């Protein structure tokens, strides 16, 4: 007889606001894919245009969703993930996908294959203005690996409303995005109505092409010269993970991690034994030759990038001391924040930066002494015989290729014109 | 199918 | 038959995430007072134990709420509230309440009256870990002004699982809290099962006992100490740039600064941005006393946001203050920070150069007791009982009976030594 | 009622 708490459309809003910095939304989509439930080998992150529209996509060849796991997905607070093979998944608090979304742009749309099925979910913001919704309701939308519609009474009202208000407007337009992912399995999460100043979007697509970039008016808050993973999203992309297990495809254009011994110069290793725990946990020091000043530490929580470029020890005290210093370490004990880009401020971190400026200090004072994109590729319309442009990290295509089943939105009948090469 | 390749210039 | 989208009781931790200084998630609490919905005059935060619980109670003389709107107060996303005669609710996002206790503790209690009908409001992590809910339900249970359950199926469950599971286990244990609302509306807020870190919970109560404080092992991520990082009254005073309400704490009243008799060689600055409309003012001064606290002082709709933000000159320039108000701009999600937009990066460019004007147009002159405590007297035992500041008038006569404090509402508890 | 006032000392 107890009332369930309610969900105010208002908060989808809420949820994004804890993401000042716009990568941050976008690395929680990125997590999504990598952890190991999905499994992904490579996530392709685009903009496109739809029905007039810009949009952002992220599309994976992970695992998918049942019809179920994916209203969780577009539910808050559900997470199950769990440690396969020493695969750690990143993903807890079963907030990101929302947040995140929604701090990207007003309204989302997902589409997955498990293999078994094929089903989209809908959360918009604009949607749910629109019919006045007191509640957050998610359409979902599902099929049978034939093009066949079950769950029939939940589907035949989220089509319907899906139809109506969502970008696609017609079945036809529904199947082509499902279409787009190549594999049995996988997902597709189409992003609209992005953010936008001056009536502008606050991403940055023209400066360059193969990358999603912040304009400048670009320094993170905390910085004072930008280091590239801040308006970069491929630079960021880079460094995100420290043993990376997923391709990250942007702009159709491969992303190639850094590695630390191309990367650092005069590397040693240290080690950390705080008393409250039970298990040693290493560091890695170098000298950071290509840059000359990104330095600081960087920290990794579960393989991925907390914050970067922290300054400690000396590096604090004074500007002149420990430049070009850079620090790796994993900690696994402290406990992410809510857009994932700083840890809780508890007495644990603070022991831990305290230790990082004293170890890097260390090192400091003893090494003191001491002193290109890869080619695009194309395919050939068999009916038309245009190229179109393809991105990479694809394994392996059919046999025939048709402008017609074309992944890129913008490219998928032959009466649109050729593209130039670069 | 048939596949070009092609250079990507900054 | 479209699905709703589904809240996780787990998703109540997360909810609180964003708070990374505790204060963060009390201010949050006063707010909800301070709003002109509630409209209160006086708040009182108090730590106090129940049933071996040590608790954070926060206590407003206050509209209170209808059922139904304590089901908002306990759900995410409703928000309504308006200016009401230039008085500006800090509310927006409908989520304070929720991150906020959730932040300072594991479970919590509503108990509010708005003198026609008194109701009971139940947010706990354990109750719903214990009967492992699948969905974040909270019980409610309300009463006619004749104390009669008024909605009664939900009520009668409500009022099981409450009793049940909740710090109170007799319907008397709820009673008393409603009762300590002295006045005919208000709401009580009672948190326990707070944060602890080793064996003792998060704050220190110990050092000052007319005060809520963070033990020294105290300064924020982002900077010696301002007293408001580590002490809850401190941080009080500075709270609102022109208070509307009265905090107490721990039962002494916290002091609002003034800017006068704070600052000198005082001037006034203005900031005409391209992007607005209006104008907005700003002032200048020096800082007496510590003067090792400086910078900045971000007000959004009477709130303070952020405090000693160094701009211009981060060394060169010191001990000079600034305060501003900046509607436009929009709080995070903890409200200790602005989204970081373009408008709020011109704003801080622009503080900083007039900062940096200020300081060299000046820059040359430069160079060259506690309020007592009020106690009153048991009629039945003749014994004197503590009294919290703010409290307009009482009843004829006062019994340990109808003690507020939780800890002294019994005739046979040794009364108190005064301070020595 | 009866009230009392006493002194509080930091
Ligand atoms: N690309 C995807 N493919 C398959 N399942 C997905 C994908 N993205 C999200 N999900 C599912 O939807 C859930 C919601 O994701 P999310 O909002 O990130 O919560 P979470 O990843 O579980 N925990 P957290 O990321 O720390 O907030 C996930 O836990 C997955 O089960
Ligand atoms: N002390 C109180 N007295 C009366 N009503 C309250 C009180 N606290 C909360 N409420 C109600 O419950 C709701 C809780 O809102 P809250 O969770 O604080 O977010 P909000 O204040 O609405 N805006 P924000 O705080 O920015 O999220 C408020 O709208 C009030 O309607
Ligand atoms: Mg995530
Ligand atoms: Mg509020
Ligand atoms: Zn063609
Ligand atoms: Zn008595």
């Given at each position: 007889?107890?009332?369930?708490?309610?969900?105010?459309p208002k908060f989808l809003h809420t949820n994004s606001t804890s993401h000042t910095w716009?990568?941050?939304?976008?690395?929680?989509?990125?997590?999504?894919?990598?952890?190991?439930?999905?499994?992904?080998?490579?996530?392709?992150?685009?903009?496109?245009?739809?029905?007039?529209?810009?949009?952002?996509?992220?599309?994976?060849?992970?695992?998918?969703?049942?019809?179920?796991?994916?209203?969780?997905?577009?539910?808050?607070?559900?997470?199950?993930?769990?440690?396969?093979?020493?695969?750690?998944?990143?993903?807890?608090?079963?907030?990101?996908?929302?947040?995140?979304?929604?701090?990207?742009?007003?309204?989302?749309?997902?589409?997955?294959?498990?293999?078994?099925?094929?089903?989209?979910?809908?959360?918009?913001?604009?949607?749910?203005?629109?019919?006045?919704?007191?509640?957050?309701?998610?359409?979902?939308?599902?099929?049978?690996?034939?093009?066949?519609?079950?769950?029939?009474?939940?589907?035949?009202?989220?089509?319907?409303?899906?139809?109506?208000?969502?970008?696609?407007?017609?079945?036809?337009?529904?199947?082509?995005?499902?279409?787009?992912?190549?594999?049995?399995?996988?997902?597709?999460?189409?992003?609209?109505?992005?953010?936008?100043?001056?009536?502008?979007?606050?991403?940055?697509?023209?400066?360059?092409?193969?990358?999603?970039?912040?304009?400048?008016?670009?320094?993170?808050?905390?910085?004072?010269?930008?280091?590239?993973?801040?308006?970069?999203?491929?630079?960021?992309?880079?460094?995100?993970?420290?043993?990376?297990?997923?391709?990250?495809?942007?702009?159709?254009?491969?992303?190639?991690?850094?590695?630390?011994?191309?990367?650092?110069?005069?590397?040693?290793?240290?080690?950390?034994?705080?008393?409250?725990?039970?298990?040693?946990?290493?560091?890695?020091?170098?000298?950071?030759?290509?840059?000359?000043?990104?330095?600081?530490?960087?920290?990794?929580?579960?393989?991925?990038?907390?914050?970067?470029?922290?300054?400690?020890?000396?590096?604090?005290?004074?500007?002149?001391?420990?430049?070009?210093?850079?620090?790796?370490?994993?900690?696994?004990?402290?406990?992410?924040?809510?857009?994932?880009?700083?840890?809780?401020?508890?007495?644990?971190?603070?022991?831990?930066?305290?230790?990082?400026?004293?170890?890097?200090?260390?090192?400091?004072?003893?090494?003191?002494?001491?002193?290109?994109?890869?080619?695009?590729?194309?395919?050939?319309?068999?009916?038309?015989?245009?190229?179109?442009?393809?991105?990479?990290?694809?394994?392996?295509?059919?046999?025939?290729?048709?402008?017609?089943?074309?992944?890129?939105?913008?490219?998928?009948?032959?009466?649109?014109?050729?593209?130039?090469?670069? | 199918?048939?596949?070009?390749?092609?250079?990507?210039?900054?």
């Amino acid at each position: 007889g107890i009332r369930l708490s309610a969900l105010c459309p208002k908060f989808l809003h809420t949820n994004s606001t804890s993401h000042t910095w716009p990568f941050s939304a976008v690395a929680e989509l990125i997590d999504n894919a990598y952890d190991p439930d999905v499994n992904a080998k490579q996530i392709w992150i685009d903009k496109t245009v739809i029905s007039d529209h810009i949009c952002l996509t992220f599309t994976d060849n992970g695992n998918g969703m049942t019809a179920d796991k994916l209203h969780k997905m577009l539910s808050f607070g559900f997470s199950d993930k769990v440690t396969m093979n020493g695969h750690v998944p990143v993903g807890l608090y079963g907030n990101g996908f929302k947040s995140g979304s929604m701090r990207l742009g007003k309204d989302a749309m997902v589409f997955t294959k498990n293999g078994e099925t094929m089903s989209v979910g809908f959360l918009s913001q604009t949607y749910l203005e629109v019919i006045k919704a007191e509640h957050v309701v998610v359409p979902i939308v599902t099929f049978n690996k034939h093009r066949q519609m079950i769950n029939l009474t939940e589907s035949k009202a989220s089509l319907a409303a899906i139809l109506e208000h969502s970008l696609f407007s017609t079945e036809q337009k529904l199947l082509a995005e499902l279409n787009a992912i190549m594999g049995k399995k996988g997902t597709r999460i189409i992003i609209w109505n992005l953010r936008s100043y001056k009536n502008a979007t606050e991403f940055d697509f023209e400066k360059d092409k193969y990358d999603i970039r912040i304009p400048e008016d670009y320094k993170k808050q905390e910085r004072q010269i930008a280091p590239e993973s801040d308006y970069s999203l491929r630079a960021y992309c880079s460094i995100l993970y420290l043993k990376p297990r997923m391709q990250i495809i942007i702009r159709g254009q491969k992303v190639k991690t850094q590695l630390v011994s191309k990367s650092l110069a005069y590397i040693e290793r240290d080690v950390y034994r705080p008393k409250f725990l039970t298990r040693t946990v290493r560091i890695t020091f170098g000298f950071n030759c290509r840059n000359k000043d990104h330095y600081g530490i960087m920290m990794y929580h579960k393989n991925r990038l907390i914050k970067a470029y922290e300054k400690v020890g000396c590096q604090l005290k004074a500007n002149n001391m420990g430049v070009g210093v850079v620090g790796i370490i994993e900690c696994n004990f402290l406990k992410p924040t809510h857009n994932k880009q700083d840890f809780d401020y508890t007495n644990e971190y603070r022991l831990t930066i305290l230790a990082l400026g004293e170890k890097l200090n260390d090192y400091w004072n003893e090494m003191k002494v001491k002193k290109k994109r890869p080619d695009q590729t194309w395919v050939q319309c068999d009916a038309c015989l245009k190229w179109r442009k393809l991105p990479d990290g694809i394994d392996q295509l059919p046999e025939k290729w048709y402008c017609s089943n074309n992944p890129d939105p913008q490219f998928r009948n032959c009466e649109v014109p050729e593209e130039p090469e670069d | 199918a048939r596949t070009k390749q092609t250079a990507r210039k900054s």
